[PDB]
Amino acid sequence: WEQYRDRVNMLQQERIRDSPLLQAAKENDLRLLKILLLNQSCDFQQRGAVGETALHVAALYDNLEAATLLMEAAPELAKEPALCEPFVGQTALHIAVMNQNLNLVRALLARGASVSARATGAAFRRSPHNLIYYGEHPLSFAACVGSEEIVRLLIEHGADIRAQDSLGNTVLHILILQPNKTFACQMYNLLLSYDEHQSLELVPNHQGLTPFKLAGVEGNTVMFQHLMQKRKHVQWTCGPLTSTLYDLTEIDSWGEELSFLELVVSSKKREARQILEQTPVKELVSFKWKKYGRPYFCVLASLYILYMICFTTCCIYRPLKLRDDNRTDPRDITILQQKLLQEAYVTHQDNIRLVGELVTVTGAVIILLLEIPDIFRVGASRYFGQTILGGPFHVIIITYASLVLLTMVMRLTNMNGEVVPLSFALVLGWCSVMYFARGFQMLGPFTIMIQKMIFGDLMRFCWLMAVVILGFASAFHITFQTEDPNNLGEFSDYPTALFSTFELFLTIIDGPANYSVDLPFMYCITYAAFAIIATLLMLNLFIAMMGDTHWRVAQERDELWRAQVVATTVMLERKMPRFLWPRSGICGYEYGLGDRWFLRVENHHD
Amino acid sequence: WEQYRDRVNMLQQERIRDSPLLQAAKENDLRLLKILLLNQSCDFQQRGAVGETALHVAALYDNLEAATLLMEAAPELAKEPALCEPFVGQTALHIAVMNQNLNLVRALLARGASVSARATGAAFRRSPHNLIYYGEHPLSFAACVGSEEIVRLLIEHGADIRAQDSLGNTVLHILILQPNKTFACQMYNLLLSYDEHQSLELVPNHQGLTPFKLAGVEGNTVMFQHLMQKRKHVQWTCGPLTSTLYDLTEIDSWGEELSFLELVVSSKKREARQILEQTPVKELVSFKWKKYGRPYFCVLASLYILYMICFTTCCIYRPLKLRDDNRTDPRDITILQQKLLQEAYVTHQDNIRLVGELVTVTGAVIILLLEIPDIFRVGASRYFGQTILGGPFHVIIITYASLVLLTMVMRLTNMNGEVVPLSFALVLGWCSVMYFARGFQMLGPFTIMIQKMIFGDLMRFCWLMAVVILGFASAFHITFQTEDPNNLGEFSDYPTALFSTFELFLTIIDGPANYSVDLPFMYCITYAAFAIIATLLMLNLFIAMMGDTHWRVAQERDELWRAQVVATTVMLERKMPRFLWPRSGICGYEYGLGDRWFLRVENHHD
């Protein structure tokens, strides 16, 4: 894993220093190389621990002259890769081009090594174990290290540009994946300069992503504006303001089932939610949200609110009747029970309840057919994970629909205890209305601040809170086991002691003090300790830390809501029919440009 | 102490100005020195108040010509130290080298004073009274003042480097203790340049610290990185990333009973918790914590949680029986008493309680044998002081174990009132579960946030709060001494008035308002004053004060938890057996480097 690389690197260094040829290639001592290399006793074809040649060692430590002597000693020697597990296809050309040694690449290609060497090594993988992902080809290595002249020399000697390595990446896919994008613009332009006849910008991965879509997924906004310098047309400039015409061929993506915007808004990266703020995308999703996204989202919110008002008033009236058996036990105070299904629906008002039951079952099943293909369309961690797609809202919507269908099963089969899934369904369903709060600037950042504090501060407070409740509830229950439960009914046995200590943590119920009887002194001492620790400190320390993280996380949740309205926009027009959602953008067929469906913006630059 | 130095300095200045020779050496008047010292009536061997020579006075005020004039008049004055209490061995060479007077040191060593002068004076001590700790030798003075050429002159005239003063420090120990580390790197290299055959880097103090260990203790991260430049080996570089090989001979410290990391994490200094974030230490303690520290810490947390669930369960079920005597006193609610040991264990369920009581007794004694050698291993203020080592958690763990054994003594000897050590043991034991919250990023900084508010803001609020409770409880008790206790049972006598005013401070219990009777008006007036002052202002000012403290202290508790996980890691593998904890790092014996047990890192610098 991580110590296997350490072990194989130490074996590599040990096999370098044990061999005289490999250590002499490392040390760049030319005369001792001449002494051991003029004799025929030494073996030119000699492996290291990773299967490396001594030429790989000489290219590893920037030894130009040692590489020239082992090249003139054997001209076949450059055409040999390492053949062990970390470097399955690494050649001396790859090591020579990663170090940006021009004369070594010149002499090594003069000897005639393959430029199409395809290194299927574990170190050259897109993995968290590896520090870089520079490629599996020498041209990908040359572009990712940032050298123009070595790229031109590699194109001059073979090395076709359309070379797809593992995970489907070409060199244009993998220029975007690198950081430090200052020199990557000119490298992208240089590699598009030799692309002269399908184009190279449209080849997909094994994931299926376009380099445009890979720039959208990875959040590389510098490559995104570099791609939109070449996908825009400036219509006119009139003094301080200009009008220009962007192309929505690759952003809107009509014919493709996996659109660009869905791959942007459902990425695992911390960025790519700031690429929605860029000049082609911001105006498009603003027009798409204000023209159609906000009115259909508001009428969907109103329909869901009216449906769950109907479900709530369908919960308020229930088939409840008087208990047939009288109560023979004190402390038992139930007077009504759930009546049977044979006596449930006989009146007109029970028929008005029954049609509301049919409405809420129909609503639950159309929720399930809306959501379960969305569960199966993406990953399960991809659907329930991000708050951008409303993942916690998705799982409570799924839980609410399953609890309503469980209530349907319990009603028809006449099982008692319907109040427990009805109350769970009421809480989770009315908290599912909070999903529709993202469409408003007033309610959206507030709602995701609530969910992000639920994930961050609420759990970390509730662990230590449950620690304090467990300890002080154990003390409160063992202070009154010797005492009368009829004077203080709280802390009578351990579950109500735990619940009572939980309520006195939050200062909800009153402090237990029956002043007409003699309470224990140790209850006063440990209640003073509980009041200093829990009520005085822990609640106010919770307020202090959540304000302290509120002022830090406020900007992040503002831009998170700004990405969330885009995710809400592109969640629609996939589920809704296309006669509700016309194709956004100015159509180019009416003006003779060839059905590319452009979008015009006007900006004031002076 | 501090005014004794003022007194001896004023006596020194008075004895300078009273003597004509000392004042003439101070004033640098050469001619008046020639008339006074050409005559034989004056005394060359003449003391000040601190036993100083007039040559010491001439060296004190950078008087070169006067000092050389007393050299040519009397050459024996250079070989003479001050012999009084603040300067027991200070010579003219020490004063000459602290002022960086090169020609004065040249002339004074040309006359032949000792370079091995060893000043056992109170001013040259590592003490808070003294401003600097420059040494007790002239070469330590030359190193700490930062002059290369006087160091080379002192090596040129005697003055071996291996000279240990009081506290066992050599020169390389004492370069690290100085601030302003810009010039101390080249001074360190210059003093290692003449170290050519045990090495000078390995001589300890009287405390036993290595200079590497002294840099680890003092938090001198500049000297730490300078030392790790010279104990590392760069294995290779390949383009943007390089792999290098640090040595863990002095960091891991196998054979030594006082390890480097324990001396780092258990220091009194505010820094050296930032020296754990350096390049060889961060990867080592991260591998040590993720590979072994987190799983055994999690299973220790689970074992402690299950043990104290067992202890809580043995607390809930107790040998309790009905009272033999009936209640002849109202306000008394005691219905049960704890039964005798002869009748305590006769059922099956009492045997299940008894085996769990044996489990918690053996748990308490293995807590005591784990903790009491850790109390005796370090200082008692060292063990219970820092929150890095979990000192408050250590003292509440000690108190919990002693209370459980006290409960064992009270159970066997049948003393009443077991609810007092059982309730304190339950509260302190379940709050000792918070010690295991430091192993998680979600719970650790929150837990030490709680302890830092307990030490800082809770005590400073509770002093002023207990002042308000005392005053308003005195007012509330003297507003209702003339009134009926049966209508308001609170404020009946003074302890329940104090407790009731304590609860009304925290807004836990309701405001005392019996609306069916005529309450006094002055209770309403002083309750309005109490509600404005305590409930409205003081509680919310406590919220505001810990918010204002939290935004300043959040970064400090982040790095405090980052040091705390290292202290948790190195607390383990000393207590746990070595078959649970293998030796961390890449072993050098398998690769022929001489069992130095290195550690390899790979870093991306470009």
Side-chain angles (χ1 to χ4, degrees):
Chain A
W1 39 101
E2 313 313 290
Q3 69 212 62
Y4 165 69
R5 299 280 176 85
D6 299 358
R7 170 159 176 81
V8 76
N9 273 350
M10 288 285 284
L11 293 174
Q12 172 181 13
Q13 290 295 321
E14 183 195 8
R15 287 281 290 105
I16 280 174
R17 62 174 162 257
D18 284 0
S19 291
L21 172 58
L22 273 80
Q23 183 62 255
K26 164 174 186 170
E27 278 176 353
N28 207 11
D29 48 352
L30 282 72
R31 47 150 307 278
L32 189 151
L33 265 190
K34 277 188 284 290
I35 295 299
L36 69 90
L37 186 63
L38 183 65
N39 198 4
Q40 264 62 41
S41 52
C42 185
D43 196 10
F44 315 122
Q45 184 62 255
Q46 164 184 190
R47 301 288 98 192
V50 298
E52 62 183 7
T53 314
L55 187 62
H56 294 88
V57 178
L60 191 44
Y61 297 104
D62 291 331
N63 292 358
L64 182 62
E65 291 88 5
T68 61
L69 281 71
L70 281 71
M71 267 160 201
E72 61 86 20
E76 69 275 16
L77 184 63
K79 280 88 70 176
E80 182 65 26
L83 73 165
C84 290
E85 183 57 44
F87 317 101
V88 183
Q90 188 192 35
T91 58
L93 183 62
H94 291 65
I95 287 169
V97 66
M98 185 179 288
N99 283 347
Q100 316 181 43
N101 201 357
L102 189 41
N103 296 115
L104 175 53
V105 170
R106 263 209 205 89
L108 194 153
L109 290 192
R111 295 291 185 269
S114 69
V115 287
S116 69
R118 186 257 185 274
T120 79
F124 320 108
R125 300 293 183 185
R126 198 197 177 175
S127 66
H129 315 142
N130 300 318
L131 277 296
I132 57 171
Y133 184 32
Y134 269 24
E136 298 174 356
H137 283 79
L139 183 62
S140 304
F141 273 12
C144 289
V145 70
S147 192
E148 290 181 354
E149 65 183 1
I150 301 170
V151 159
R152 297 163 183 276
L153 188 153
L154 277 182
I155 301 299
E156 266 177 51
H157 295 285
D160 70 318
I161 298 89
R162 295 186 181 87
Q164 322 180 39
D165 53 80
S166 181
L167 282 75
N169 288 331
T170 69
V171 65
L172 277 299
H173 292 247
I174 203 164
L175 276 175
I176 299 187
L177 292 153
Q178 312 305 309
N180 197 7
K181 275 84 68 176
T182 49
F183 51 88
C185 291
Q186 307 88 321
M187 198 59 34
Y188 209 103
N189 282 126
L190 174 61
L191 280 159
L192 293 198
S193 71
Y194 294 84
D195 179 37
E196 299 298 319
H197 305 275
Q198 195 198 47
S199 161
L200 171 55
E201 283 268 10
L202 298 153
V203 287
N205 290 318
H206 297 344
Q207 209 165 339
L209 316 180
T210 302
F212 196 85
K213 293 193 222 138
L214 192 44
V217 161
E218 290 303 310
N220 204 329
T221 183
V222 182
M223 294 298 102
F224 188 78
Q225 317 285 152
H226 171 263
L227 280 168
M228 293 296 173
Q229 294 298 109
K230 280 73 176 175
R231 273 150 200 86
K232 88 194 194 186
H233 176 226
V234 194
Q235 273 178 320
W236 45 264
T237 63
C238 197
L241 60 85
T242 187
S243 164
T244 182
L245 190 72
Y246 291 93
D247 196 5
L248 299 183
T249 288
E250 293 197 80
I251 296 185
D252 210 20
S253 78
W254 178 249
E256 313 164 56
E257 64 270 14
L258 294 174
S259 70
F260 173 76
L261 286 173
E262 293 179 353
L263 294 174
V264 159
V265 298
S266 72
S267 85
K268 290 285 179 68
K269 295 263 304 180
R270 186 191 62 83
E271 47 262 10
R273 64 179 176 88
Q274 69 199 53
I275 210 172
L276 291 174
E277 294 293 328
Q278 305 315 297
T279 318
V281 189
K282 174 189 281 290
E283 271 82 356
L284 167 68
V285 306
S286 285
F287 159 72
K288 209 181 288 187
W289 170 252
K290 294 181 176 67
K291 201 71 181 315
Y292 316 102
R294 195 190 295 120
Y296 308 133
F297 197 52
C298 280
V299 76
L300 211 65
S302 296
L303 209 61
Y304 194 79
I305 279 162
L306 179 62
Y307 154 75
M308 183 95 62
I309 283 168
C310 168
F311 173 59
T312 297
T313 190
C314 195
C315 285
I316 299 315
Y317 311 84
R318 273 192 321 165
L320 259 56
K321 76 156 173 292
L322 285 182
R323 284 181 62 188
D324 46 358
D325 55 333
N326 63 6
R327 299 189 303 276
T328 59
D329 196 3
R331 300 174 53 89
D332 177 57
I333 46 167
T334 303
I335 56 168
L336 262 63
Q337 76 192 8
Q338 283 164 199
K339 82 182 80 169
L340 277 296
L341 201 73
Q342 293 82 17
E343 48 200 347
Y345 316 92
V346 63
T347 43
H348 178 220
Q349 184 178 2
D350 291 331
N351 286 337
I352 315 310
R353 191 194 61 239
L354 172 62
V355 66
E357 288 181 359
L358 294 174
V359 168
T360 185
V361 175
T362 300
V365 301
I366 67 167
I367 286 169
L368 283 181
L369 281 71
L370 280 182
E371 288 288 324
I372 297 169
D374 268 23
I375 297 169
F376 290 176
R377 208 185 93 91
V378 285
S381 71
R382 185 64 60 85
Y383 201 47
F384 302 136
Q386 289 85 17
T387 186
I388 280 176
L389 309 168
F393 297 113
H394 288 323
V395 68
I396 68 170
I397 278 165
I398 284 296
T399 311
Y400 157 74
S402 62
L403 277 158
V404 165
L405 283 192
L406 171 70
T407 307
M408 167 182 111
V409 174
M410 293 177 70
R411 181 75 67 86
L412 295 168
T413 61
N414 277 328
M415 294 182 286
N416 266 260
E418 184 178 1
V419 65
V420 165
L422 272 183
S423 58
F424 279 127
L426 277 164
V427 169
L428 292 175
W430 268 111
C431 286
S432 293
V433 180
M434 294 180 183
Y435 175 72
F436 295 100
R438 68 195 42 208
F440 314 104
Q441 185 155 19
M442 182 179 72
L443 300 185
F446 179 52
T447 310
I448 62 170
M449 192 64 240
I450 290 163
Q451 318 291 135
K452 274 167 73 93
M453 271 155 177
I454 279 171
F455 286 12
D457 283 4
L458 188 67
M459 295 298 103
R460 83 163 50 105
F461 184 75
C462 279
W463 275 111
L464 277 296
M465 183 177 176
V467 165
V468 179
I469 296 169
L470 269 162
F472 276 104
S474 308
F476 290 153
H477 183 223
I478 319 297
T479 304
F480 284 112
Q481 264 196 343
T482 45
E483 308 286 10
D484 212 349
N486 287 358
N487 294 94
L488 268 75
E490 58 267 47
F491 324 125
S492 66
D493 46 351
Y494 196 66
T496 195
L498 204 62
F499 188 46
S500 173
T501 302
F502 164 71
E503 294 174 282
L504 302 168
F505 202 108
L506 293 164
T507 71
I508 295 172
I509 63 161
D510 267 1
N514 194 358
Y515 294 113
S516 167
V517 297
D518 274 331
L519 293 197
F521 79 106
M522 185 54 50
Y523 181 75
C524 305
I525 295 172
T526 194
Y527 197 57
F530 182 64
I532 293 300
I533 288 302
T535 72
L536 174 61
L537 186 148
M538 287 264 288
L539 212 61
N540 308 309
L541 194 156
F542 188 50
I543 303 174
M545 55 167 305
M546 67 182 289
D548 189 29
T549 187
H550 201 299
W551 78 266
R552 302 172 200 273
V553 173
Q555 188 200 65
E556 195 207 340
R557 51 93 175 165
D558 281 335
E559 53 199 43
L560 265 174
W561 174 78
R562 283 208 293 278
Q564 218 172 19
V565 296
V566 187
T568 318
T569 310
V570 66
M571 187 269 294
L572 303 176
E573 72 182 1
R574 192 188 72 233
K575 285 192 171 294
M576 293 177 71
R578 298 297 299 163
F579 81 83
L580 277 297
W581 283 82
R583 187 171 178 177
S584 58
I586 296 92
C587 175
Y589 184 56
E590 322 183 26
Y591 316 103
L593 307 156
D595 73 13
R596 273 190 281 173
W597 282 82
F598 297 94
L599 186 144
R600 187 200 74 86
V601 303
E602 205 154 308
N603 65 92
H604 184 252
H605 55 248
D606 276 335
Chain B
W1 40 101
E2 310 316 290
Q3 69 212 62
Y4 165 69
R5 298 280 176 85
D6 299 358
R7 171 159 176 81
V8 75
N9 273 350
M10 288 285 284
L11 293 174
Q12 172 182 13
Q13 290 295 321
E14 183 195 8
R15 288 282 289 105
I16 280 175
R17 62 174 161 257
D18 284 359
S19 301
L21 172 58
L22 272 78
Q23 183 62 255
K26 164 174 186 170
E27 279 177 354
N28 207 10
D29 48 352
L30 274 81
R31 44 169 291 275
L32 189 150
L33 270 189
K34 290 180 177 67
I35 295 89
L36 72 90
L37 189 62
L38 182 66
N39 197 5
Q40 264 62 41
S41 52
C42 185
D43 196 10
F44 318 119
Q45 184 63 255
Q46 172 181 6
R47 297 284 74 78
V50 298
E52 61 185 6
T53 312
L55 185 62
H56 290 216
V57 178
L60 191 43
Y61 298 104
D62 291 331
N63 293 357
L64 183 63
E65 291 89 5
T68 61
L69 188 153
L70 281 71
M71 294 296 173
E72 61 86 20
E76 293 83 3
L77 294 174
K79 280 88 70 176
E80 185 70 30
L83 73 165
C84 294
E85 183 57 45
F87 317 101
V88 186
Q90 188 192 35
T91 58
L93 183 62
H94 291 65
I95 294 159
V97 66
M98 185 179 288
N99 283 348
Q100 316 181 44
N101 202 355
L102 183 63
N103 296 115
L104 174 55
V105 172
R106 263 208 205 88
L108 194 155
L109 290 191
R111 296 291 185 269
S114 69
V115 288
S116 68
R118 185 257 186 274
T120 78
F124 320 107
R125 300 292 183 184
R126 198 198 176 174
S127 66
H129 315 142
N130 300 318
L131 277 296
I132 56 171
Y133 183 33
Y134 269 24
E136 298 176 358
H137 284 78
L139 191 152
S140 304
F141 273 13
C144 291
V145 70
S147 193
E148 292 180 354
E149 65 183 1
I150 322 175
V151 159
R152 298 163 183 276
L153 183 63
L154 277 181
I155 301 299
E156 267 177 51
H157 295 285
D160 67 318
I161 302 93
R162 293 186 181 87
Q164 322 179 39
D165 60 352
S166 180
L167 283 72
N169 297 31
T170 69
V171 184
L172 277 297
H173 293 249
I174 209 160
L175 276 172
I176 298 186
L177 293 152
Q178 313 305 309
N180 197 7
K181 276 85 68 176
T182 49
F183 51 88
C185 292
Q186 310 91 311
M187 191 61 31
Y188 210 101
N189 281 307
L190 174 63
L191 282 153
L192 293 204
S193 71
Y194 308 88
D195 179 37
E196 300 298 319
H197 306 275
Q198 196 198 47
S199 161
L200 175 63
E201 285 268 10
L202 297 153
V203 285
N205 290 318
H206 296 344
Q207 184 178 2
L209 316 180
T210 304
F212 194 81
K213 292 193 222 138
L214 193 44
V217 161
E218 290 303 310
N220 204 330
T221 183
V222 182
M223 295 298 103
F224 186 77
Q225 297 264 57
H226 170 264
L227 282 169
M228 286 288 114
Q229 294 298 109
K230 280 73 176 175
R231 292 180 179 91
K232 89 194 194 186
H233 176 226
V234 176
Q235 280 181 348
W236 45 264
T237 187
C238 197
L241 59 85
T242 176
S243 164
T244 183
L245 189 72
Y246 293 94
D247 195 9
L248 300 181
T249 299
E250 268 181 297
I251 298 181
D252 209 19
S253 77
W254 176 249
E256 313 161 56
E257 64 270 14
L258 294 174
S259 70
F260 174 76
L261 285 173
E262 293 179 354
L263 294 174
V264 159
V265 298
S266 72
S267 85
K268 292 288 182 68
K269 294 263 304 180
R270 187 191 62 83
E271 69 275 16
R273 70 177 145 91
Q274 69 200 54
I275 210 171
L276 290 173
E277 294 293 328
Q278 303 312 116
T279 317
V281 187
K282 175 188 281 291
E283 269 86 337
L284 166 68
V285 307
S286 286
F287 159 72
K288 209 181 287 188
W289 170 252
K290 294 181 176 67
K291 201 70 181 315
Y292 316 102
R294 195 190 295 120
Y296 309 132
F297 198 53
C298 280
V299 76
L300 211 65
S302 296
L303 209 61
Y304 194 79
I305 279 162
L306 179 62
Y307 153 75
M308 183 95 62
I309 283 168
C310 168
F311 172 60
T312 299
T313 305
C314 284
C315 284
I316 299 315
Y317 311 85
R318 274 191 321 165
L320 259 57
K321 76 156 173 292
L322 286 182
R323 284 180 62 188
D324 47 351
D325 55 333
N326 63 6
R327 299 189 302 275
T328 59
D329 196 3
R331 300 174 53 89
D332 176 57
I333 62 170
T334 303
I335 55 169
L336 262 63
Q337 74 193 8
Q338 64 182 357
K339 81 184 79 169
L340 277 296
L341 203 73
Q342 293 82 17
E343 49 200 347
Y345 310 92
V346 63
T347 56
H348 179 221
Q349 280 95 45
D350 291 331
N351 286 337
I352 317 305
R353 189 193 61 239
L354 171 62
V355 294
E357 283 178 359
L358 294 174
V359 162
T360 189
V361 160
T362 61
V365 302
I366 67 167
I367 286 169
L368 284 182
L369 281 71
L370 280 182
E371 287 288 324
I372 297 169
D374 268 22
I375 297 169
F376 290 176
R377 208 185 93 91
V378 285
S381 70
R382 183 65 60 85
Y383 202 46
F384 302 135
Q386 288 85 17
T387 185
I388 281 175
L389 309 168
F393 297 113
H394 288 323
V395 68
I396 68 176
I397 275 162
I398 280 292
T399 311
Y400 157 74
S402 63
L403 277 158
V404 165
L405 282 191
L406 170 70
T407 308
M408 182 180 72
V409 174
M410 293 177 70
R411 180 75 65 86
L412 296 169
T413 61
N414 278 328
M415 294 182 286
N416 267 260
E418 209 159 308
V419 65
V420 173
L422 271 183
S423 51
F424 286 126
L426 277 164
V427 169
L428 292 175
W430 267 111
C431 286
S432 291
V433 180
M434 293 180 183
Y435 175 72
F436 295 101
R438 69 195 42 208
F440 314 104
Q441 185 155 19
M442 186 176 80
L443 300 185
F446 179 51
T447 310
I448 62 170
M449 207 58 237
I450 291 162
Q451 318 294 132
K452 289 184 79 69
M453 294 296 172
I454 279 171
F455 285 16
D457 284 2
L458 187 68
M459 284 318 123
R460 83 163 50 105
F461 184 75
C462 278
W463 275 110
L464 277 296
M465 158 186 187
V467 165
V468 178
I469 296 169
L470 269 162
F472 276 104
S474 309
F476 289 152
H477 182 225
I478 319 297
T479 304
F480 279 112
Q481 263 195 343
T482 45
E483 295 294 328
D484 212 349
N486 287 358
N487 294 94
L488 270 77
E490 57 268 49
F491 324 125
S492 66
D493 46 350
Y494 195 66
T496 195
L498 204 62
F499 188 46
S500 174
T501 302
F502 163 70
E503 295 175 281
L504 300 172
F505 201 108
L506 292 166
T507 67
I508 294 172
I509 63 161
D510 267 1
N514 194 358
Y515 294 113
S516 168
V517 299
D518 274 331
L519 291 201
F521 77 105
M522 179 59 47
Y523 154 65
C524 305
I525 294 172
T526 195
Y527 197 56
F530 182 64
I532 294 301
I533 289 302
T535 72
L536 174 60
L537 186 147
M538 287 267 279
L539 212 61
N540 308 309
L541 203 158
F542 190 49
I543 304 176
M545 182 179 72
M546 321 184 310
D548 189 29
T549 307
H550 202 298
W551 82 266
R552 301 173 200 273
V553 164
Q555 188 200 65
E556 195 207 340
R557 51 93 174 166
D558 281 335
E559 54 199 43
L560 266 174
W561 174 77
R562 283 207 293 279
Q564 219 171 18
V565 296
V566 187
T568 318
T569 310
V570 66
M571 187 269 294
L572 303 176
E573 72 182 0
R574 192 188 72 232
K575 285 192 171 294
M576 293 177 71
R578 298 296 299 163
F579 82 82
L580 277 297
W581 283 81
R583 187 172 178 178
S584 58
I586 295 92
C587 174
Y589 183 55
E590 321 183 26
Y591 316 104
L593 308 154
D595 65 272
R596 271 190 281 173
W597 282 82
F598 297 94
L599 186 144
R600 188 201 72 87
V601 304
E602 205 154 308
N603 64 93
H604 184 252
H605 54 245
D606 277 335

